Amino acid sequence: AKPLSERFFIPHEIKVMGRWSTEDVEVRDPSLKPYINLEPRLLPHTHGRHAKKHFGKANVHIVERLINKIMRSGGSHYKVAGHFMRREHRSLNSKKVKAYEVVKEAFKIIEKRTGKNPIQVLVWAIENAAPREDTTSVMFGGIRYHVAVDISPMRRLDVALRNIALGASAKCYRTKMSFAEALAEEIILAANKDPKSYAYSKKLEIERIAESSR
Amino acid sequence: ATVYDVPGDLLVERVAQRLKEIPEIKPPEWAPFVKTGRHKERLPEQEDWWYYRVASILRRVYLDGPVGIERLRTYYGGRKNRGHAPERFYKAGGSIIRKALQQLEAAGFVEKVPGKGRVITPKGRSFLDKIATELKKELEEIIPELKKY
Amino acid sequence: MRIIQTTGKRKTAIARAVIREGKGRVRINGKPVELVEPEIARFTILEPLILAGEEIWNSVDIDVKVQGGGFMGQAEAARIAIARALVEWTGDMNLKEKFIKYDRTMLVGDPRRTEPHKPNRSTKGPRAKRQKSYR
Amino acid sequence: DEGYPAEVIEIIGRTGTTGDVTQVKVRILEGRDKGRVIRRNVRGPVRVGDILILRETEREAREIK
Amino acid sequence: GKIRQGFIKRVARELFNKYPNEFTRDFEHNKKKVEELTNVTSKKIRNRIAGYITKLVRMKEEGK
RNA sequence: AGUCCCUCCCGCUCGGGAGGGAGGCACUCUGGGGGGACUGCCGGCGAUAAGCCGGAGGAAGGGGCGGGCGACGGUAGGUCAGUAUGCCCCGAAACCCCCGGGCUACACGCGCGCUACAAUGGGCGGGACAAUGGGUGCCGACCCCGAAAGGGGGAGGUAAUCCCCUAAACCCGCCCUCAGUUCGGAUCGCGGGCUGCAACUCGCCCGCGUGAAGCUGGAAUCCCUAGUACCCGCGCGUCAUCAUCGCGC
RNA sequence: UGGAGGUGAUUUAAAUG
RNA sequence: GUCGGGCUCAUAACCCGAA
Numbered sequence: 001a002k003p004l005s006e007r008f009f010i011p012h013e014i015k016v017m018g019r020w021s022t023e024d025v026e027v028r029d030p031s032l033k034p035y036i037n038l039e040p041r042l043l044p045h046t047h048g049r050h051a052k053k054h055f056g057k058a059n060v061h062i063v064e065r066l067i068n069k070i071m072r073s074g075g076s077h078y079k080v081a082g083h084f085m086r087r088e089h090r091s092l093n094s095k096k097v098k099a100y101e102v103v104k105e106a107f108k109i110i111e112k113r114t115g116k117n118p119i120q121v122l123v124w125a126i127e128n129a130a131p132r133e134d135t136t137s138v139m140f141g142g143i144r145y146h147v148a149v150d151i152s153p154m155r156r157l158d159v160a161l162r163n164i165a166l167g168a169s170a171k172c173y174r175t176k177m178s179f180a181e182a183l184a185e186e187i188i189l190a191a192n193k194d195p196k197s198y199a200y201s202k203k204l205e206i207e208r209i210a211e212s213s214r
Numbered sequence: 215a216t217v218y219d220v221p222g223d224l225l226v227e228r229v230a231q232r233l234k235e236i237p238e239i240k241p242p243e244w245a246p247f248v249k250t251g252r253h254k255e256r257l258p259e260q261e262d263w264w265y266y267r268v269a270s271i272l273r274r275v276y277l278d279g280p281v282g283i284e285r286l287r288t289y290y291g292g293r294k295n296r297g298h299a300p301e302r303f304y305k306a307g308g309s310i311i312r313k314a315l316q317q318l319e320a321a322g323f324v325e326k327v328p329g330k331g332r333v334i335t336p337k338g339r340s341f342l343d344k345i346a347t348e349l350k351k352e353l354e355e356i357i358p359e360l361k362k363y
Numbered sequence: 364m365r366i367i368q369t370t371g372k373r374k375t376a377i378a379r380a381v382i383r384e385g386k387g388r389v390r391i392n393g394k395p396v397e398l399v400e401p402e403i404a405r406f407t408i409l410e411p412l413i414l415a416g417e418e419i420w421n422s423v424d425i426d427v428k429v430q431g432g433g434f435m436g437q438a439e440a441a442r443i444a445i446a447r448a449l450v451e452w453t454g455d456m457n458l459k460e461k462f463i464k465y466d467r468t469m470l471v472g473d474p475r476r477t478e479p480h481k482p483n484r485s486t487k488g489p490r491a492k493r494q495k496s497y498r
Numbered sequence: 499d500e501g502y503p504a505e506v507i508e509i510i511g512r513t514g515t516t517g518d519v520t521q522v523k524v525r526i527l528e529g530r531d532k533g534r535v536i537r538r539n540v541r542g543p544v545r546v547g548d549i550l551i552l553r554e555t556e557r558e559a560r561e562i563k
Numbered sequence: 564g565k566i567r568q569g570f571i572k573r574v575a576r577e578l579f580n581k582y583p584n585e586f587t588r589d590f591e592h593n594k595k596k597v598e599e600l601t602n603v604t605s606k607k608i609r610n611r612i613a614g615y616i617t618k619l620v621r622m623k624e625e626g627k
Numbered sequence: 628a629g630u631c632c633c634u635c636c637c638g639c640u641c642g643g644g645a646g647g648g649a650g651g652c653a654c655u656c657u658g659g660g661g662g663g664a665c666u667g668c669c670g671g672c673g674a675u676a677a678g679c680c681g682g683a684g685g686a687a688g689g690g691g692c693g694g695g696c697g698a699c700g701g702u703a704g705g706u707c708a709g710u711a712u713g714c715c716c717c718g719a720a721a722c723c724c725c726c727g728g729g730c731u732a733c734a735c736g737c738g739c740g741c742u743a744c745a746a747u748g749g750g751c752g753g754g755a756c757a758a759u760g761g762g763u764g765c766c767g768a769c770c771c772c773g774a775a776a777g778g779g780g781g782a783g784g785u786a787a788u789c790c791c792c793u794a795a796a797c798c799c800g801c802c803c804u805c806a807g808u809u810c811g812g813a814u815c816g817c818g819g820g821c822u823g824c825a826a827c828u829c830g831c832c833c834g835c836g837u838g839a840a841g842c843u844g845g846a847a848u849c850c851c852u853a854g855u856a857c858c859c860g861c862g863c864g865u866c867a868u869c870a871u872c873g874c875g876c
Numbered sequence: 877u878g879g880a881g882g883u884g885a886u887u888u889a890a891a892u893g
Numbered sequence: 894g895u896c897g898g899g900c901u902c903a904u905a906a907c908c909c910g911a912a
């Protein structure tokens with residue numbers, strides 16, 4: 001099936017996975033620019049050396065952040081689209097090789113479907129999925145109320161990545177679609193502001209709730 | 215070119231195809247009916263699985279000789295599903311391995327070192343390394359980095 | 364006839380590498396580095412050679428023997444050994460400065476090891492514990 | 499429709515029921531009150547030099563102790 | 564918290580007074596001096612004493 | 628690893644590999660001794676004290692990281708069914724032995740787990756890489772026989788020497804394509820083995836057949852801050868035989 | 877240092893041994 | 894109203910499921 005030229009691939013330049021350059025990738029949102037790392041790098045695997053230090057995740061390449069985000073079960077102690085998704089012995093917890101391959105196949109599908117550099121489409125999706133206003137909870141008379149606040153850029157980035165991953169996780173659960181295809185679909189839908197995207201709808205809902213509680 | 219210069223699975227495939235020409239390699243009469251070990255569930259799906267197992271055993275003797283039945287039984291074992299109990303490792307059986315080694319000796323490719331096991335003969339080394347050379351020649355047409363080796 | 368030896372370690376894996384003038388052949392336990400699988404392991408070993416450049420890469424031969432640990436531990440230990448051998452062999456500080464910027468661990472290593480396990484669900488880990496019930 | 503960016507210049511302190519909120523002073527970078535300094539409440543980790551996107555610039559948070 | 568221990572301070576003050584012209588603002592020199600002038604057996608304790616003596620030397624030389 | 632000799636392979640040998648012997652202690656490792664980190668250096672906050680916050684250099688930075696060691700007491704907390712011991716009882720039985728049963732019963736309520744409800748998979752063939760420990764009432768390579776479980780001989784080992792010991796999760800190729808199914812493997816029939824004085828009550832293993840509930844879980848509620856949690860197998864204890872457990876890797 | 881007065885306020889429900 | 898489970902040191906109140 002897979003040609004031998006792809007099974008034994010030897011790169012010669014420093015670019016993402018030896019296949020895609022990020023030299024023309026632009027980040028439009030001024031708040032998210034210092035936190036989306038795009039410095040040239042071949043293998044996106046830093047072996048978890050960033051979590052110890054405060055604000056360490058800022059200098060981690062965005063593709064590795066995405067790979068880390070999908071290395072999970074998905075629905076452990078809260079429901080996604082109305083269900084727990086507890087996968088346990090057949091999850092991707094700690095299996096970084098399989099997650100890496102999922103991201104690679106999704107990138108190839110994205111590039112074939114749209115004709116653009118996949119990193120750019122991913123950046124557009126995370127820009128459209130990042131909320132700008134949220135809420136905090138107060139208690140009075142045994143009743144819980146909302147109060148509107150602003151969101152820092154690092155939390156915006158984390159929430160956008162988490163919701164993209166959860167949308168992909170829901171689209172492939174007990175259906176004929178595969179994980180790579182679901183991820184490519186979610187990224188493309190979020191890039192175009194289609195309400196069929198989990199992350200974009202979640203983003204709209206959060207902003208609406210924050211707006212109606214000022 | 216040697217066995218060390220090519221991927222193992224492709225070499226096993228090529229060697230298995232070439233082994234069908236040697237008259238001394240023949241599946242036993244019980245071959246259509248058995249599993250390859252207590253940790254499997256279903257019979258082999260290839261009608262010509264005997265030749266693949268024989269080729270794998272020959273390459274194993276080439277790389278790790280001298281070697282005997284028990285250690286090969288370790289190599290061909292695996293994980294077993296035990297119903298409601300947790301999965302566990304188990305060894306493979308011995309009849310397939312012992313018969314394959316006896317047939318290979320009948321063909322002159324291996325020989326017996328007393329109290330130590332079986333080792334590859336110069337004939338067997340030449341047989342394997344020629345096929346490896348042929349595969350490597352084909353291989354470096356599409357992977358130019360393999361010409362330096 | 365120069366021969367230079369270097370060492371690398373990563374979580375119970377140990378790698379010893381030897382370097383001399385050659386044609387660009389790099390072998391790992393006797394296998395060409397171009398055929399290492401999976402791809403994620405192959406890219407781990409190849410990064411220092413790509414950083415150094417094609418001129419330096421094709422002018423040497425490297426042999427690496429590595430034992431212990433697992434398939435990702437062995438790749439990283441070999442990477443450390445190769446980077447140290449390249450900095451010592453060529454003896455230039457632009458390349459060394461290039462390694463520290465891209466990945467400091469390439470030259471300083473990784474000291475992390477497993478934490479010993481403790482009672483209350485000892486087989487699972489030092490900190491994980493049994494579910495607690497009150498009734 | 500696209501909000502207004504503002505730069506954090508000073509950290510005041512933590513607040514909220516569970517300590518999850520930080521109050522800051524920000525300087526508006528764009529729009530009608532460009533140059534005005536106001537204080538705001540933020541959810542999430544934040545440092546000096548960050549940029550927020552405010553959806554409106556007329557609400558100011560109550561000063562905390 | 565890196566709160567200095569009481570007996571370390573006591574012994575460092577005793578050493579400093581007896582030989583005012585023996586300790587400088589160099590940690591290595593003071594480490595060797597503490598090694599020669601006491602019967603301290605722990606390498607950690609020797610380093611702690613030498614560091615406090617260094618701070619004393621620079622505090623008195625600065626005039627407090 | 629470099630160096631000398633011998634043998635065998637390849638593209639027939641300019642070159643590239645694999646064994647064996649001579650030789651060496653380089654490298655890895657083993658284990659005795661020593662060095663190294665002190666808020667020592669730099670800039671702020673605080674008082675100019677005690678200290679705190681941020682930088683350099685560094686293998687390591689602020690109890691460096693993980694463990695052992697739990698004050699005066701209380702808890703009439705647990706234990707006389709580990710051993711020691713006062714009183715009260717039995718003392719031809721409530722002491723000492725032997726045989727067969729029972730602790731393994733089953734309308735039902737509860738704790739802690741294992742296996743699943745499938746594609747972030749199931750099956751079939753092929754390819755990879757560990758560490759801790761243990762062995763003479765024993766570990767057993769290697770050969771032969773058997774489809775399997777197993778059976779018949781048996782080198783070496785009182786052990787850095789010989790053995791348990793070529794892990795699984797992972798990777799490649801083919802079948803299955805969202806179905807109570809090539810998901811799941813409970814339950815039961817027939818047959819073959821091992822340990823033991825004894826296998827029905829009441830043991831473990833293998834072959835063919837059989838194919839239950841389960842399609843993600845209400846109110847509630849648990850563990851965890853880094854080589855940690857999740858996921859994956861392995862060693863030892865118990866042990867004649869028997870691990871869904873404990874302690875460790 | 878330590879005292880005596882005045883005016884304002886007090887974010888659901890929560891019994892028993 | 895009956896039966897079962899949650900919450901509480903426990904009972905009552907309160908929450909959930911079922912016939």
Ligand SMILES: [Mg+2]
Nearest residue numbers: 289290291292
């Ligand atoms: Mg296998």
Ligand SMILES: [Mg+2]
Nearest residue numbers: 089295296301
């Ligand atoms: Mg299973």
Ligand SMILES: [Mg+2]
Nearest residue numbers: 089299300301
């Ligand atoms: Mg399991």
Ligand SMILES: [Mg+2]
Nearest residue numbers: 477487488489
């Ligand atoms: Mg562990």
Ligand SMILES: [Mg+2]
Nearest residue numbers: 690692693694
């Ligand atoms: Mg400590």
Ligand SMILES: [Mg+2]
Nearest residue numbers: 702703704705
């Ligand atoms: Mg009592």
Ligand SMILES: [Mg+2]
Nearest residue numbers: 702703704705
């Ligand atoms: Mg009690």
Ligand SMILES: [Mg+2]
Nearest residue numbers: 729730731732
């Ligand atoms: Mg009992």
Ligand SMILES: [Mg+2]
Nearest residue numbers: 749809810811
């Ligand atoms: Mg099945």
Ligand SMILES: [Mg+2]
Nearest residue numbers: 292293751752
């Ligand atoms: Mg398999």
Ligand SMILES: [Mg+2]
Nearest residue numbers: 807808810838
């Ligand atoms: Mg069925």
Ligand SMILES: [Mg+2]
Nearest residue numbers: 816817818819
């Ligand atoms: Mg029967």
Ligand SMILES: [Mg+2]
Nearest residue numbers: 826827829830
């Ligand atoms: Mg019975």
Ligand SMILES: [Mg+2]
Nearest residue numbers: 807840841842
């Ligand atoms: Mg049903």
Ligand SMILES: [Mg+2]
Nearest residue numbers: 174745805842
């Ligand atoms: Mg289904």
Ligand SMILES: [Mg+2]
Nearest residue numbers: 865870872873
């Ligand atoms: Mg027990």
